[PDB]
């Protein structure tokens, strides 16, 4: 046969990988004050970024919900908690919304980068100095304290309301996000290109649930499912 589509797409990512910003905030020993300068828009991502200014140095950050040009925010380990400020994790009471959490201390940020997605805090445990967070995916993860984070819900709202009612709307989405579009179903192909292909009618003939035990080039279909079907 020939090399299929999945392996040929990953080696096309090594010839020209996709490029993004990775915005991080600095670290400062005591509480300082900074000003918001302007709001911009990037090519790949939907959430707008913000340029703040600490000690006559301009950095880049993800914009929170209510933010206007010229406003003042504070950064430090013991800043007061309000909209757009960045404090330590232990100060916030249970029930609020944070949107950039570093895994360890003195890191930029790891969790909650996209627009419209936020996390919640559920508790504090004074023994061993740990707090449990509620991830946007729905899983409870235990975080160590003394990491610092930003208070508020991120901007850009709910983008998934109105559909791509035309085909032309989805053309410019996948082109900016560097994905392959359109896609051909694997049953329509000839049996050289794909395992499911060929035949006299369009059907599969093999079970579509494939274990994870098998090697890398044999993985296709619903890989390693614990369940299949509508629940009710």
Partner RNA sequence: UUAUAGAGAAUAUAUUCGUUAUUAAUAGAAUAGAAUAAUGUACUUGAGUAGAGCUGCUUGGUAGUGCAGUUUGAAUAAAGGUAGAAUGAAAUAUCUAAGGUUAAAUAUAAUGGUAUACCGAUAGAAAAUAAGUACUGCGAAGGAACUUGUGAAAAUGUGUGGAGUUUAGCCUUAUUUUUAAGGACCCGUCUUGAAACACGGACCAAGGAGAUUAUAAUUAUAGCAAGAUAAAAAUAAUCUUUAUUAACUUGAUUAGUUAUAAUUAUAAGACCCGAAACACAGUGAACUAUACAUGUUCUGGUUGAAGAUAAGCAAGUUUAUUGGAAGACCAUAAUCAUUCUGACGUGCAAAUCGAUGAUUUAAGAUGUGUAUAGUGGCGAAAGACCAAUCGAACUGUGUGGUAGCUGGUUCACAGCGAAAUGUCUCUCAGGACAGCAGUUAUUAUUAUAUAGGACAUAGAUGU
Partner RNA sequence: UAUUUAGGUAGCUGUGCAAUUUGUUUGUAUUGAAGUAUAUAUGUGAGUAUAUAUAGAAGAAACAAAUGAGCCGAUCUUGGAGGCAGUAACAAUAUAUGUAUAGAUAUAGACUAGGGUUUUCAAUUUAUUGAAGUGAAUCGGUGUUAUAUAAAAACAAAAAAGAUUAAUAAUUCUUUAUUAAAUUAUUAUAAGGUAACUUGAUAAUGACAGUAUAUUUCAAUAAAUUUAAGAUAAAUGAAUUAAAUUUUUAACUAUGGAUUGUCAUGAUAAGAAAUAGUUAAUUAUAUAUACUUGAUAAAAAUAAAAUAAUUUUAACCGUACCUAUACCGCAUCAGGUGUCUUUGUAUCAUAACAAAUAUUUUAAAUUAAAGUAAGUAAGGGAAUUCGGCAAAUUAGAUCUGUAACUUUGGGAUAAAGAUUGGCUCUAGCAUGCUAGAACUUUUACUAUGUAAGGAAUCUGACUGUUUAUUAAAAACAUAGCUUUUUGUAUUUACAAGAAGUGAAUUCUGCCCAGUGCAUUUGUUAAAGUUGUGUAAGCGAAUGUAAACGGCGGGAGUACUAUGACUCUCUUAAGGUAGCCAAAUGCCUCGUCAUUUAAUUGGUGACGCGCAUGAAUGGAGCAACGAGAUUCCUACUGUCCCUACUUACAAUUUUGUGAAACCACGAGACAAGGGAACGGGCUUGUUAUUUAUCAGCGGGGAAAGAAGACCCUGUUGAGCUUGACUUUAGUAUGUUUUAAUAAAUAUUCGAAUAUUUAUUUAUUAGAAUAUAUGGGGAGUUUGGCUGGGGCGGUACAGCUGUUAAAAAGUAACACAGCUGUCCUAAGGUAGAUGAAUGAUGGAUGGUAACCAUCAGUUUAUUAUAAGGGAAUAAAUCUGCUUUACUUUAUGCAUAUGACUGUAUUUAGUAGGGAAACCUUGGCCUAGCGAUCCCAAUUACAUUCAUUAUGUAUUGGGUGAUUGAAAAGUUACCACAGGGAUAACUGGCUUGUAGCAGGCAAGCGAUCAUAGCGACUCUGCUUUUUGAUUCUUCGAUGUCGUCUCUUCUGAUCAUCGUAGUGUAUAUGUUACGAAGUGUUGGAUUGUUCACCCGGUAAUGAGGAACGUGAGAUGGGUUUAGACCGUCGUGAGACAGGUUAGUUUUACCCUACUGUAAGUAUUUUUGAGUGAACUUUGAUAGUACGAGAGGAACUCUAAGUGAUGACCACUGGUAGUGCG
Inter-CA distances, 74 with 2, 15, 22, 59, 71, Å: 58, 43, 22, 14, 10
Tokens representing residue 216 in the block: 């890398």
Bridge partners of residue 148, in order along the sequence: 88
Q: Does position 168 bind RNA by CB under 7 A? A: yes
Binding mask 128-157 toward RNA (x if CB under 7 A, else -) reads -------xxx-x-x---------------x
Q: Does position 170 bind RNA by CB under 7 A? A: yes
For the sheet containing 32-40, what is the strand order?
A: 58-62, 49-53, 32-40, 72-75, 86-88, 148-150
Binding RNA by CB under 7 A: which of 69, 78, 129, 211?
A: 211
Binding RNA by CB under 7 A: which of 39, 96, 132, 187?
A: 187
Q: Does position 26 bind RNA by CB under 7 A? A: no
Q: Shortest Cβ distance from residue 7 to RNA (Å)?
A: 7
Residues 69-98 that bind RNA (CB under 7 A): none
- Only one of the segments 28-36, 68-76, 89-97, 199-207 lies at the binding site for RNA (rule: CB under 7 A); that segment is 199-207
Binding Mg ion by CB under 5 A: which of 1, 66, 80, 224?
A: 1
Tokens representing residue 203 in the block: 């059907």
Q: Does position 182 bind RNA by CB under 7 A? A: yes
Strands 222-223 and 209-210, by their bridges, are parallel
Q: Are 114 and 59 in contact (CB under 8 A)?
A: no
Q: Are 26 and 53 in contact (CB under 8 A)?
A: no
Binding RNA by CB under 7 A: which of 77, 114, 132, 145?
A: 114
Tokens representing residue 63 in the block: 């914009």
Please identify, using beta-carbon distances, which residue of 95 and 138 lies nearer to RNA: 138
In degrees, to the nearest 5, what angle opens at C-alpha 126 toward C-alphas 139 and 130? 35
Binding RNA by CB under 7 A: which of 32, 33, 144, 218?
A: 218
Please identify, using beta-carbon distances, which residue of 1 and 44 lies nearer to Mg ion: 1
Strands 140-144 and 130-134, by their bridges, are antiparallel
Q: Shortest Cβ distance from residue 68 to RNA (Å)?
A: 11
């Amino acid at each position: 046969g020939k090399v299929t589509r999945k392996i040929r797409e990953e080696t096309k990512k090594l010839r020209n990988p996709r490029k993004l910003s990775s915005p991080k905030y600095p670290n400062f020993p005591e509480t300082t004050q900074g000003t918001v300068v302007d709001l911009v828009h990037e090519r790949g991502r939907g959430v707008p970024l913000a340029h703040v200014k600490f000690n006559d140095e301009i950095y880049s950050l993800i914009a929170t919900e209510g933010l206007y040009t010229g406003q003042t925010i504070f950064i430090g380990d013991n800043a007061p908690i309000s909209i757009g400020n960045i404090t330590k994790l232990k100060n916030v009471p249970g029930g609020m919304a944070v949107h950039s959490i570093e895994y360890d201390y003195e890191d930029g940020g790891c969790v909650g980068m996209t627009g419209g997605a936020y996390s919640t805090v559920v508790t504090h445990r004074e023994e061993t100095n740990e707090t449990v967070l509620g991830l946007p995916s729905g899983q409870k993860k235990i975080f160590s304290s003394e990491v610092r984070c930003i208070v508020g819900v991120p901007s850009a709202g709910g983008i998934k309301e109105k559909p791509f009612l035309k085909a032309s709307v989805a053309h410019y989405f996948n082109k900016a996000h560097c994905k392959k579009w359109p896609r051909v179903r694997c049953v329509a192909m000839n049996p050289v290109d794909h395992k499911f292909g060929g035949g006299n009618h369009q059907h599969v003939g093999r079970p579509t649930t494939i274990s994870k035990r098998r090697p890398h080039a044999q993985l296709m279909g619903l890989i390693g499912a614990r369940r299949t079907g509508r629940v009710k």
